[PDB]
Amino acid sequence: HMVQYIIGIGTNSGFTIENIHLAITALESQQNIRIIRKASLYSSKAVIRFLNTAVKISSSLKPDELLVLLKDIELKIRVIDLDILAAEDLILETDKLTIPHKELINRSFALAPLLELSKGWHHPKYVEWDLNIRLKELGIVKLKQTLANTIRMGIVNLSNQSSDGNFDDNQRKLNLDELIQSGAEIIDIGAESTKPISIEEEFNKLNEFLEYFKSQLANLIYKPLVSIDTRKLEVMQKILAKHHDIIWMINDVECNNIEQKAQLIAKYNKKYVIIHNDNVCDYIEQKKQILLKHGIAQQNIYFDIGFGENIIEIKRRLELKALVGHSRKPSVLGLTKDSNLATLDRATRELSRKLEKLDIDIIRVHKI
Ligand SMILES: [Mg+2]
């Protein structure tokens, strides 16, 4: 027979959302588990901030078996916490486990996603306790970051197409805040624009911002994955040296020095984006084989059309996850090129909402 379980999932170290998807993927991988539904992402304060959700699963696993599975997944992914919140109306009391979880009614970050998945759930020991009133008595933020297949990469530009006052240079910080409130799961930080800048200057812009990011780590309701945008082998080297621990991906619009780049990225176990800078398949295909040739796993490679109607065809040919950067590009948005940042951002949300349905792995945007 099948039993419906709610699994609570929390994390507050490393790449938080990645840890959550990895735990879910691990569950889904079991031949005796089916994933019915995922809850939203919730952020709570560390007694840096926790990221919590819950998933509802169907399984023939007995509770104790299911607990064994959770412990192993925890050991594989300790930077993640997996708990059996509930099994419908089941009541199990033992030293090994109690269902519902002892602390469920004392943790808004547990009860909140649980009631989201099962709005009608009542605690089987307290069938008269209206858990919504209980939830309110407790002490929580429901993020706009989601567990969706398409993740949003928010653009944080450190260059000069973007404005200091006499005693205020807060613009880039405010915009990090904006992106995080609005659901960006990933931020892409770039220090160049669209006159060259030196290695040392590009590095300094990036580093000042990552050092700022780190100082805010516990102030962030959500710690996004970090992508660095640079075409320079040397800034990559410097930035990974100091900050690899918060960097998830490298976004590189320059095939110059690929071999050395691939060795670095391989060594640091980070994601790489191939950018185009039809036949386009083969361009990406060639670069693609070099990277593999230098030691980086194929799963870690994304491709990008590089605009500067049939992407799904291309991805499927390519064997690689799609990253799409359509934000504020008047051509692909089919707008006049004079249109204001207000109308550009509008058309782009409209199109973002469209690419989200096709399961584009990453969309890169200025605004959510
Ligand atoms: Mg635990």
Author numbering: 0 to 46, 57 to 86, 98 to 159, 161 to 183, 185 to 216, 221 to 303, 320 to 350, 363 to 422
What does the paper say about this structure?
Here, we report the structure of the F. tularensis enzyme and show that it is fused to 6-hydroxymethyl-7,8-dihydropterin pyrophosphokinase (FtHPPK) which catalyzes the previous step in the pathway. DHPS acts at a crucial convergence point in the folate pathway, and catalyzes the condensation of p-aminobenzoic acid (pABA) and 6-hydroxymethyl-7,8–dihydropterin-pyrophosphate (DHPPP) to form the intermediate dihydropteroate.
The two molecules in the asymmetric unit are very similar (RMSD of 0.4 Å on α-carbons) and differ only in the flexible loop regions. Regions missing in the final model due to disorder are residues 44–56 and 89–98 within the FtHPPK module, and residues 213–224, 304–318 and 354 within the FtDHPS. In addition, there was no observable electron density for the N-terminal 20 residues that correspond to the His6-tag. However, as anticipated from the sequence alignment, only seven of the eight surrounding α-helices are present (Dα1-Dα2-Dα3-Dα4-Dα5-Dα6-Dα7) with the carboxy-terminal Dα8 helix missing. The gap in the TIM barrel is partly filled by Lys421 and Ile422 that follow Dβ8 at the C-terminus, and by the flanking helices Dα1 and Dα7 that move slightly inwards to fill the space, but there remains a significant cleft on the surface of the TIM-barrel structure. In both molecules in the asymmetric unit, D1 (residues 180 to 193) is folded into an extended β-ribbon and makes a crystal contact with a neighboring molecule via Phe189.
